[PDB]
Design an enzyme around this catalytic site. Structure first.
Site, PDB file in Angstrom:
ATOM      1  N   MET A  33      13.060  -2.029   7.507  1.00  0.00           N
ATOM      2  CA  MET A  33      13.410  -2.736   6.378  1.00  0.00           C
ATOM      3  C   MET A  33      13.868  -1.502   5.195  1.00  0.00           C
ATOM      4  O   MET A  33      12.988  -1.018   4.613  1.00  0.00           O
ATOM      5  CB  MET A  33      12.173  -3.425   5.829  1.00  0.00           C
ATOM      6  CG  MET A  33      11.768  -4.389   6.799  1.00  0.00           C
ATOM      7  SD  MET A  33      12.533  -6.071   7.267  1.00  0.00           S
ATOM      8  CE  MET A  33      11.855  -6.763   5.701  1.00  0.00           C
ATOM      9  N   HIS A  57       7.997  -2.823   9.547  1.00  0.00           N
ATOM     10  CA  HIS A  57       8.591  -3.358  10.805  1.00  0.00           C
ATOM     11  C   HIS A  57       8.428  -2.297  11.902  1.00  0.00           C
ATOM     12  O   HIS A  57       8.526  -2.608  12.996  1.00  0.00           O
ATOM     13  CB  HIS A  57      10.132  -3.517  10.544  1.00  0.00           C
ATOM     14  CG  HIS A  57      10.512  -4.567  11.682  1.00  0.00           C
ATOM     15  ND1 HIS A  57      11.592  -5.402  11.437  1.00  0.00           N
ATOM     16  CD2 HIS A  57      10.312  -4.774  12.911  1.00  0.00           C
ATOM     17  CE1 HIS A  57      11.773  -6.067  12.635  1.00  0.00           C
ATOM     18  NE2 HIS A  57      11.093  -5.517  13.610  1.00  0.00           N
ATOM     19  N   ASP A  75       7.274   2.109 -11.546  1.00  0.00           N
ATOM     20  CA  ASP A  75       7.933   1.882 -10.220  1.00  0.00           C
ATOM     21  C   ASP A  75       8.651   0.715 -10.436  1.00  0.00           C
ATOM     22  O   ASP A  75       7.921  -0.417 -10.302  1.00  0.00           O
ATOM     23  CB  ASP A  75       6.982   2.186  -8.955  1.00  0.00           C
ATOM     24  CG  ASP A  75       7.267   1.845  -7.520  1.00  0.00           C
ATOM     25  OD1 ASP A  75       8.725   1.674  -7.621  1.00  0.00           O
ATOM     26  OD2 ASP A  75       6.863   2.023  -6.616  1.00  0.00           O
ATOM     27  N   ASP A  93       4.435   2.577  -1.640  1.00  0.00           N
ATOM     28  CA  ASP A  93       3.534   3.889  -2.067  1.00  0.00           C
ATOM     29  C   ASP A  93       3.109   4.232  -0.766  1.00  0.00           C
ATOM     30  O   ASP A  93       2.912   5.589  -0.727  1.00  0.00           O
ATOM     31  CB  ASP A  93       2.198   3.659  -2.751  1.00  0.00           C
ATOM     32  CG  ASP A  93       2.485   3.066  -4.429  1.00  0.00           C
ATOM     33  OD1 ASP A  93       3.524   2.975  -4.892  1.00  0.00           O
ATOM     34  OD2 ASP A  93       1.420   3.067  -5.254  1.00  0.00           O
ATOM     35  N   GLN A 141       6.891   6.015  -2.283  1.00  0.00           N
ATOM     36  CA  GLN A 141       7.876   5.264  -2.960  1.00  0.00           C
ATOM     37  C   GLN A 141       7.366   4.699  -4.195  1.00  0.00           C
ATOM     38  O   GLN A 141       6.471   3.857  -4.248  1.00  0.00           O
ATOM     39  CB  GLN A 141       8.937   4.519  -2.334  1.00  0.00           C
ATOM     40  CG  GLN A 141       9.391   4.996  -1.091  1.00  0.00           C
ATOM     41  CD  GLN A 141      10.455   6.112  -1.576  1.00  0.00           C
ATOM     42  OE1 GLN A 141      11.500   6.253  -2.208  1.00  0.00           O
ATOM     43  NE2 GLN A 141      10.066   7.435  -0.912  1.00  0.00           N
ATOM     44  N   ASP A 144      -2.897  11.203  -2.458  1.00  0.00           N
ATOM     45  CA  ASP A 144      -1.304  11.549  -2.155  1.00  0.00           C
ATOM     46  C   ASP A 144      -0.998  11.125  -0.786  1.00  0.00           C
ATOM     47  O   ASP A 144      -1.294  11.745   0.174  1.00  0.00           O
ATOM     48  CB  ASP A 144      -1.034  13.013  -2.766  1.00  0.00           C
ATOM     49  CG  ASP A 144       0.362  13.456  -2.605  1.00  0.00           C
ATOM     50  OD1 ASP A 144       1.080  12.390  -2.273  1.00  0.00           O
ATOM     51  OD2 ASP A 144       0.578  14.323  -3.209  1.00  0.00           O
TER      52      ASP A 144
HETATM   53 CA   LIG Z   1       5.020   3.317  -6.587  1.00  0.00          CA
END
Ligand SMILES: [Ca+2]
Ligand SMILES: [Cl-]
Lengths: 285, 292
Positions: free
Chosen positions: B19, B90, B216, B260, B264, B275
């Site tokens: 995806m 996916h 975000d 995340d 991202q 992290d």
């Molecule tokens: Ca984020």
């Protein structure tokens, strides 16, 4: 280590690879961060206090003076850093524009100058930064719609060449698999000689690999042709004037006479389903 | 240029996506720019990392066939017998496909935020009965479609069959696929799976949060779907915590959203959350410590 780790780490080593100089003074490197992050991970499983306890108790039992001090000192200034990263407000603009991500990064840079010095900032982040800036920059080179794609591509290649050689080699390593596909699919799209392909491979992966690659080609050809020739016989049985159970039995028999292991029997289903629906069979993409 | 041997496993680290977006002349549309600084990181930590580029939108099986071949390519290039597969979303079922048909080449399976038990969001898109919802569904689908349509001719053109892809992440599809590749999948609704079968180790870790950091650009969107996925929102915004459990769950409550998980966007995440880069570098250590 059961005293320092969280329940989820009971199966790992402590990432604290802290480089001490030629006089027992902590030299801040990319790992110094990894060290903190390692413990920080415990948060969410632990409370904020335990995360400090563990970290302090660990450093105490590992390193001594003076570095010890410096370490805990920088740790404190790092935690208060983590928290003071919530002090970045969303600016009003098309939230999908570089001049955004850039500012969002700048806001952090400015917070870093609130807890670290040029030297420390460099030691803890420089590495990651290089890539971050590399990524950001590309975005702006792509969003600059006053350049031709042919020019953008050129600027991208130029910007790539500006990175510290290390990054180039590393990235090229992480993209090698794609590079292989690229050339394999290019060279074969105009019917090159096996020798050309051999050199192209020998160049990117080396003889040893090249040979096993050649070994693979064959295995795929086989598998492919087995399925090819298999579905043909399955179609003949399908288009026969027999009953469902008879066709399924005949098919089964053909499947057990060509695909013995349970494993092949699974893969087969994949091609079967695609074929029965008039899709192209997955062999090359 | 590698500084430590902290993520130096025996068998290579292979990451499979799923995806993603249109492949413009960027670098790694759905490759390196999918796993934000995780790969290069694990690379400097001594690891041997290989990212796989499969069809973003297609059935678990076709993606599986695609992946498998790259796996072989890698085994051939590295000379190592087995590989460590790590799939996100996916990519989860996509590595399971390979595990099911070549268990001799697979050392470990690691799934992050994978819709093993399926995704409620996937079902909704396909709905026809449920007129009001179905409306917003078809609509949203048409937009998501439009966004990739905006790309056009993909340089790296992968067989695009979104319907099948959706049908592969649905509650039914995922069940149908599980029935055939049940290794690691739980029998209980929200329990774990087998830690090890056919000599393969299996690990899954996921997030259970939608909003992580309002900077975000996508949290807004993820929050939307979170309500579709689960009213009480025990999900990363797309995949409930239950559907993501597979084999040994390292931890299933990270303050991470579905993106995340892959670090991202650009590394934006909750204020106090582990992290991704380090969590991955920590898992990479555990595999090494497992002689994988
Ligand atoms: Ca984020
Ligand atoms: Cl966390």
């Amino acid at each position: 280590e059961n005293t320092y780790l969280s329940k989820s780490q009971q199966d790992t080593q402590v990432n604290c690879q802290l480089k001490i100089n030629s006089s027992q003074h902590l030299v801040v490197n990319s790992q110094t961060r990894d060290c903190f992050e390692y413990f920080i991970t415990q948060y969410g499983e632990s409370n904020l206090q335990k995360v400090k306890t563990h970290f302090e108790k660990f450093i105490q039992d590992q390193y001594l003076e003076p570095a010890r001090s410096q370490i805990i000192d920088l740790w404190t200034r790092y935690l208060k850093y983590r928290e003071q990263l919530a002090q970045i407000q969303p600016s009003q603009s098309k939230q999908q524009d570089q001049n955004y991500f850039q500012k969002v990064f700048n806001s952090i840079q400015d917070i870093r100058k609130r807890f670290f010095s040029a030297s420390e900032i460099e030691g803890l982040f420089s590495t990651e930064d290089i890539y971050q800036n590399y990524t950001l920059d590309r975005m702006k080179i792509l969003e600059d719609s006053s350049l031709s794609e042919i020019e953008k591509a050129k600027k991208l290649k130029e910007r790539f060449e500006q990175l510290p050689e290390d990054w180039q080699e590393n990235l090229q390593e992480l993209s090698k698999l794609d590079d292989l596909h690229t050339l394999t699919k290019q060279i074969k799209a105009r019917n090159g000689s096996a020798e050309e392909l051999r050199q192209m491979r020998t160049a990117l992966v080396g003889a040893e690999a090249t040979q096993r690659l050649e070994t693979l080609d064959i295995q795929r050809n086989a598998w492919q042709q087995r399925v090819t020739g298999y579905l043909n016989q399955r179609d003949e049985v399908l288009h026969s004037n027999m009953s469902d159970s008879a066709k399924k039995q005949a098919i089964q028999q053909l499947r057990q006479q060509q695909f013995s292991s349970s494993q092949e029997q699974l893969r087969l289903r994949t091609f079967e389903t695609v074929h029965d629906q008039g899709g192209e069979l997955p062999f090359n993409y | 240029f590698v500084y430590s041997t902290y993520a130096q496993t025996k068998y290579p680290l292979v990451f499979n996506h799923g995806m993603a977006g249109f492949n413009r002349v960027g670098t790694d549309t759905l490759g390196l720019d999918y796993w934000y600084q995780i790969l290069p990181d694990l690379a400097r930590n001594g690891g041997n990392v290989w990212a796989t580029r499969v069809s973003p939108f297609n059935s678990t099986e076709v993606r599986g066939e695609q992946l498998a071949q790259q796996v072989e390519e890698i085994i051939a290039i590295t000379g190592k017998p087995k590989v460590n597969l790590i799939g996100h979303s996916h990519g989860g079922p996509t590595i399971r496909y390979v595990a099911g048909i070549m268990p001799e080449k697979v050392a470990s399976l690691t799934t992050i935020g994978a819709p093993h038990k399926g995704s409620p969001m996937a079902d909704v898109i396909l709905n026809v009965e449920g007129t009001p919802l179905s409306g917003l569904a078809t609509l949203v689908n048409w937009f998501s479609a439009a966004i990739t349509w905006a790309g056009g001719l993909d340089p790296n053109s992968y067989p695009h069959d979104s319907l099948a892809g959706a049908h592969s992440l649905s509650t039914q599809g995922s069940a149908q696929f599980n029935a055939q590749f049940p290794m690691g999948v739980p029998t209980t609704s929200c329990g774990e799976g087998a830690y090890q079968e056919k000599g393969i180790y299996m690990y899954s870790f996921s997030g259970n949060k939608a909003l992580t950091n309002p900077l975000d650009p996508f949290d807004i969107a993820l929050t939307g779907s979170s309500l579709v996925v689960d009213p009480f929102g025990d999900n990363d915004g797309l995949v409930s915590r239950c559907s993501a459990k597979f084999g040994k769950t390292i931890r299933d409550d990270y303050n991470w959203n579905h993106l995340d998980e892959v670090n991202q966007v650009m590394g934006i995440r909750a204020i106090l959350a582990a992290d991704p880069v380090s969590v991955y570098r920590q898992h990479a250590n555990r595999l090494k410590l497992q002689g994988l």
